[PDB]
Ligand binder design. Structure first.
Ligand SMILES: *[C@H](C)[C@H]1/C(=C/c2[nH]c(/C=C3N=C(/C=C4\NC(=O)C(CC)=C4C)C(C)=C\3CCC(=O)O)c(CCC(=O)O)c2C)NC(=O)[C@@H]1C
Ligand SMILES: *[C@H](C)[C@H]1/C(=C/c2[nH]c(/C=C3N=C(/C=C4\NC(=O)C(CC)=C4C)C(C)=C\3CCC(=O)O)c(CCC(=O)O)c2C)NC(=O)[C@@H]1C
Ligand SMILES: *[C@H](C)[C@H]1/C(=C/c2[nH]c(/C=C3N=C(/C=C4\NC(=O)C(CC)=C4C)C(C)=C\3CCC(=O)O)c(CCC(=O)O)c2C)NC(=O)[C@@H]1C
Ligand SMILES: *[C@H](C)[C@H]1/C(=C/c2[nH]c(/C=C3N=C(/C=C4\NC(=O)C(CC)=C4C)C(C)=C\3CCC(=O)O)c(CCC(=O)O)c2C)NC(=O)[C@@H]1C
Ligand SMILES: *[C@H](C)[C@H]1/C(=C/c2[nH]c(/C=C3N=C(/C=C4\NC(=O)C(CC)=C4C)C(C)=C\3CCC(=O)O)c(CCC(=O)O)c2C)NC(=O)[C@@H]1C
Ligand SMILES: *[C@H](C)[C@H]1/C(=C/c2[nH]c(/C=C3N=C(/C=C4\NC(=O)C(CC)=C4C)C(C)=C\3CCC(=O)O)c(CCC(=O)O)c2C)NC(=O)[C@@H]1C
Ligand SMILES: [Cl-]
Ligand SMILES: [Cl-]
Ligand SMILES: [Cl-]
Lengths: 160, 158, 160, 158, 160, 158
C-alpha cells in the first residue's frame, strides 16, 4: 500500500527536494477530490451490510447457484461469498479513499484467480456480482463517487 | 503509512473493519483545509531562501556563539542547508497531515548526530525558533495555523 | 571470547600441568605489554565520542553520503552509522586489551558483511572510515598502542 | 571469563559501555606487578616437590592421625598428589589475577568429595596451612604477597 | 509413581468391585515381602553415604577418570557424580520399597541417556559403578533384599 | 499416593532425603500385621451381603423412619448398595493402611450428595453404626482392630 500523498512525498524525500509543481498540482486535485471521497467512505462504512445485501439480492439470488449443486450452497459457501464481497467492498473503499489501487493488488488480487479456479468458484458470477455492486453503489453514493468506486471495482474485475 | 489517509486506512485494515466515525472526523479536518495546505507548501517552497537568511540573521543576533559564526563559510553553509532541509520537512508534514515526515526524516537519531557533530542544542532551539518567527511573518495567519504545530514539534525536539 | 591469559591457563588445566616455558614466556611478554594496553584503553574510554567524531569528520562527512540518496541520510541512518563505529571502536579496544581478536569474531564479524550487503550499506566507505579511525587513534594514543589498535581494526576490515 | 582481564571486559560489555575507571584501576594493579606473577608461577612450578614433601613432614608432625599416616603408601601418594594439585591451582590464580581458577577447579564441590572419601577437613586445614608456611619460606616476601590471598582462600574453604 | 497397593486398589475402584483373588493374592505376597523391604530400606537410609563411598571406591577411583581430562575431574564433576549415584540409590530404594519400577522411569530414566551423551558422561562407567553398587549392597543387605535392589538397579542400567 | 507406602515415599522424595525413622516406624506397623489385612479384606469381601442385610435389619429396628422403610423396594436397594459400597471402601483402607480410599472415594462431597438426595444424616449415623456392630460380630477381635478406625472414620463423617 502506497496512497497518493505518500507516493508524492516519498520521491521528493529521496530527491531531497520540495514537491515540484507537477506533483504538487496532481496532489492539489486529489485534495479537492477530498471531502467527497470521505463522504463516500462515510456512506459506505455505515451501510456496508445493506450494500452487500442489495448486491447479492440482484445478481446472485433466486437461481441455481444457491440451490444444491450450486457454489453458494450450503450456508457455509453463502457465508464465504458474503464475506468475499465484503472484502471487495472494503478494499475498494480503501483504494478509493487513497485514490490508489495498490491496496487492491497486494491484499486482494494476488493468487485470487488461481484460488477461485482451484476452488471451483464461478469467476463470471463474481464479476457479475461486482457489476451489480457498482449499480448498487451508483444508487447510494454521489455521482463522481460512484464513478471512482466503479474504477476501483473494475480493477478487481480486471484482476479476476 | 506516512500520510494521514494511509494511517487511517492502516488502522481500519488492521481491525478488519470499515472506517469509524473518528477516522471520518480526522479526514474531514484534513481535507477541508487542503487548499491552504497546497498554498502553504507552495509558499514555503517559493521563498525558502528568504526565510533561511532572514532567520539566520535573527539567530546570529540572538546567539552569536554558534559554529556558524566562526568565520569559515562552510559550517555556515551547512547550517543554512539544515534550515532549508527542516523547512522542507515542515512542508512535507503540512501536505501529509501529520508530523511523521518530520519524525522519520528529521528527528529520528537527530540528537546523536548533532552531539557528535558538536552543534549545540540550545543553538538549534533558538535557530528553529527564529525560523518559525520569520515563517510566521511570511506565510499568513491561517497557513501558519497549519505550520505552527510542526514548527513547534521541530522546536520541542531540541 | 577467550583472552590471552585464559587461552594459556585453560590448556594447562586440561593437561593438569603448570604453564610450561613457551606459554609462560608468551604470557610474560603480554604482561609487559600490559600497562600500555591499559593506558590506551583508558585514553579510548574517556575520549570515545571525540574519536568517533574525528573519524566521521575526516572520512564520511562533507560529501554525497550525508546528502539525500546517501546512506547516511536521514538522521536515523547517520545515528546508525555512528553507533556502528562506536561498536567497532569498543570491540577493537576489548580485543586490544585482551590481545586476542576472538571477541571481534563472535560479537562483531558474524553475518556483518551479509547484513551490509542486504541493507545496501557501502562496505568500502565503512572500510575507509575504519582506515581513518586508525589515523585518528594514531594521533591520540602512544606509538605501539596505535599499532595494536591498527591490528585489531584491520581484523574488522579484513572481516568486512 | 576466568582471568581478570576477561572479567573486566565481560562486565564492560554487559553494560554496553567502555572501560570505567574502577576497571582501569583493577587492571593497573594487575599489570604493574605482572613480572612478579610470572616469577612466582615459575618458582611454584620449579620446586613444587620440595614444597610438597617439606609441607607433608610438618603436617605429619602437626597431625599424625591422617589417612596418609596409616602405613600404606598409596593414600600417602594421593595426598602428595592433592598438595601438588592445589599448588598448581594457586599458580593459576597468581597468573589469572583472581581466585577463579581455585574456585572453579578446586573448591566447587570439594567438600562433598572429601567427606565421601573420608578425608577429614581439619586435616586439610592444617595441611594447607603447612603448605602455605613452606611456600612462604620458598617464594619471597613479595611473590608470597601475591600468593597468600590465594593460599588463604584455599585454607578458608576447609 | 504407582506402587503395588495402589496399582491393585485403583482398578478395583474403577470396576467398583473388591480386590479379586488374583490381585489380592499378588498383594498378599507383597505383604510378606514386607518387613524385609522395610529392613533393607532402614539399612540403606542410615548407611547411604557409606554405600556410595564404597561404590565409588571400587569402580571409579584410582584411575584416569579422576585425573585431569577425566569426567570426574575437577571436584565439581566428582560432586556431580556423587549426587548422581545418591539419586540412583535413593530412587532404587523407593522402587524397591514400592515393589514397582515406575518411580525409576518418571523421575530418573527420562532423558538421562541423552543428557549423558550430550554432557560426555561415560555411560559404561556409570553402568559399571551401578554394577559395583549391587555388590556393595549384596555385602550389606540380606539375601533376597540384595536381589530386589539388584532388579531395581538393573532397571536403571537397562534404561541407560 | 493413596496407599501408606506411596505416601511415605512421596514425603521422603519431597524433602530430597532417604527414609527417616518415623517412616520406617510407620511401615513397620503396617507390614507386621499385613496378613491380618489380607484376611480382613478377604473376609469383608466374602460375606458382604450377610453384613449388609443383618445390619439393615438392626438399622430398621433402631430407625424405622428411613427412606428405605417407605415401601418401594428401589430406595431400599439403593441403601443396600450404599452399605456394600462403604464396606468395600473400608476394605480398601484396610489394604492401603490409611483412610485415604475412604476420604477420596467416600467422604469427599458426600454431605452435599446426601442432603440433595434427601437421605437424612442421623439415619446414616445409625446405619453405619449398625454396620460396624455386625462387622465386629463377623470379622474377629483383631481383624476388627484394623477395621474399627475406618468404620469410626466413616461413622464420624455423618
Ligand atoms: C461469491 C462472490 C462467489 C463465491 C465465493 C466463495 N469464495 C470462497 C473461498 C475463498 N474466498 C477467498 C477470497 C479472499 N480471502 C481474503 O483474505 C481476500 C482479500 C481480503 C479474498 C478476496 C479465499 C482465499 C478462499 C479460500 C479459503 C477460504 O475458504 O477461506 C468460497 C468457499 C469455497 C469453498 O469450497 O468453501 C466461496 C463459496 N462463490 C460463488 O459462487 C459466488 C459467485
Ligand atoms: C544551523 C541551523 C545550526 C548548525 C548547523 C551545522 N550542521 C552541520 C553539519 C551537518 N548537519 C547535518 C544535518 C542533517 N542530516 C539529516 O539527515 C537532516 C534531516 C533531514 C539534517 C538536518 C549533517 C549530515 C551534517 C554533516 C556534514 C554533511 O552534511 O556532510 C554543521 C557542521 C558540523 C561539522 O563538524 O562539520 C553545522 C555547523 N550550526 C549552528 O550554529 C546552528 C545551530
Ligand atoms: C557507517 C559506518 C556506515 C553505515 C552504517 C549503517 N549500519 C546500519 C544498520 C545496521 N548496523 C549493524 C551492525 C552491528 N549491530 C551490532 O550489534 C554490531 C556488533 C556489536 C554491529 C557491527 C546491524 C546489525 C544493522 C541492521 C539492524 C539495525 O539497523 O539496527 C545502518 C542502517 C541501515 C538502514 O537501512 O537503516 C547504517 C546506515 N552506512 C554508511 O553509509 C556508513 C558508511
Ligand atoms: C593430603 C593433603 C590429604 C589427604 C588426601 C587424600 N586424597 C585422596 C583421594 C582423592 N583426592 C582427590 C582430589 C582432588 N580431585 C580434584 O579434582 C581436585 C582439585 C583439582 C582434588 C584436590 C580425588 C579425586 C581422590 C580419589 C582417588 C583418585 O584420585 O582416583 C585420598 C584417598 C582417599 C581414598 O578413599 O582413597 C587421600 C587419603 N589425606 C590426608 O591425610 C591429607 C589431609
Ligand atoms: C558418575 C556416576 C558418572 C558421572 C556423573 C555426572 N553427571 C553429571 C551431570 C548431570 N547428572 C544428571 C542426572 C540426574 N539429575 C536428576 O535430577 C536425576 C534423577 C533424580 C538424575 C539421574 C543431570 C540431569 C546432569 C546435568 C545437569 C547438572 O549438571 O546438574 C555430571 C556433570 C557433567 C558436567 O559437565 O559437569 C557428571 C560428571 N560422570 C562420570 O564420569 C561418572 C562415571
Ligand atoms: C442406606 C444406608 C441409607 C439411604 C440410602 C439411599 N441412597 C440413595 C441414592 C443414592 N446413593 C448414592 C451413594 C453413593 N455415590 C458414591 O459415589 C458413594 C461412595 C462410593 C455413595 C455411597 C447415589 C449416587 C445415589 C443416587 C441414585 C443412583 O445411584 O443412581 C437413596 C435414594 C434417594 C433418591 O432420591 O433416589 C437412598 C434412599 N437411605 C436410608 O434410609 C439409609 C440411611
Ligand atoms: Cl467465511
Ligand atoms: Cl541506531
Ligand atoms: Cl551437583
Amino acid at each position: 500500500m502506497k496512497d497518493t500523498i505518500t507516493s508524492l512525498i516519498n520521491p521528493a524525500d529521496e530527491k531531497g527536494s520540495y514537491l515540484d509543481a507537477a506533483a504538487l498540482e496532481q496532489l492539489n486535485r486529489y485534495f479537492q477530490s477530498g471531502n467527497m471521497r470521505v463522504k463516500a467512505a462515510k456512506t459506505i462504512s455505515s451501510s456496508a451490510s445493506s450494500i452487500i445485501s442489495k448486491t447479492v439480492a440482484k445478481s446472485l439470488l433466486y437461481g441455481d447457484i444457491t440451490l444444491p449443486g450450486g457454489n453458494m450452497y450450503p450456508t457455509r459457501r453463502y457465508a464465504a461469498c458474503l464475506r468475499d464481497l465484503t472484502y471487495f467492498l472494503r478494499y475498494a473503499t480503501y483504494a478509493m479513499l487513497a485514490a490508489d489501487p495498490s491496496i487492491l493488488d497486494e491484499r486482494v488480487l494476488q493468487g485470487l484467480k488461481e484460488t477461485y479456479i482451484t476452488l471451483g468458484v464461478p469467476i463470471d458470477r463474481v464479476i457479475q456480482a461486482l457489476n451489480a455492486m457498482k449499480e448498487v453503489l451508483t444508487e447510494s453514493l454521489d455521482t463522481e463517487a460512484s464513478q471512482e468506486m466503479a474504477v476501483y471495482l473494475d480493477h478487481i474485475i480486471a484482476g479476476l | 503509512s506516512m500520510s494521514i489517509v494511509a494511517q487511517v486506512i492502516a488502522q481500519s485494515d488492521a481491525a478488519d473493519r470499515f472506517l469509524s466515525s473518528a477516522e471520518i472526523a480526522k479526514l474531514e479536518d484534513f481535507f477541508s483545509k487542503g487548499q491552504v495546505r497546497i498554498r502553504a507548501a507552495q509558499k514555503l517552497a517559493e521563498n525558502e531562501q528568504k526565510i533561511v537568511q532572514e532567520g539566520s540573521k535573527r539567530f546570529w543576533a540572538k546567539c552569536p556563539n554558534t559554529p556558524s559564526n566562526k568565520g569559515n563559510p562552510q559550517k555556515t553553509a551547512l547550517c543554512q542547508r539544515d534550515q532549508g532541509w527542516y523547512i522542507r520537512l515542515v512542508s512535507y508534514c503540512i501536505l501529509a497531515g501529520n508530523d511523521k515526515p518530520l519524525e522519520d526524516i528529521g528527528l529520528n537519531g537527530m540528537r546523536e548526530m548533532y552531539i557528535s557533530l558538536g552543534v549545540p542544542l540550545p543553538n538549534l532551539r533558538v535557530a528553529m525558533s527564529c525560523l518559525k518567527e520569520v515563517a510566521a511573518g511570511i506565510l499568513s495567519s491561517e497557513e501558519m495555523a497549519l505550520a505552527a504545530p510542526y514548527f513547534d514539534r521541530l522546536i520541542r525536539a531540541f
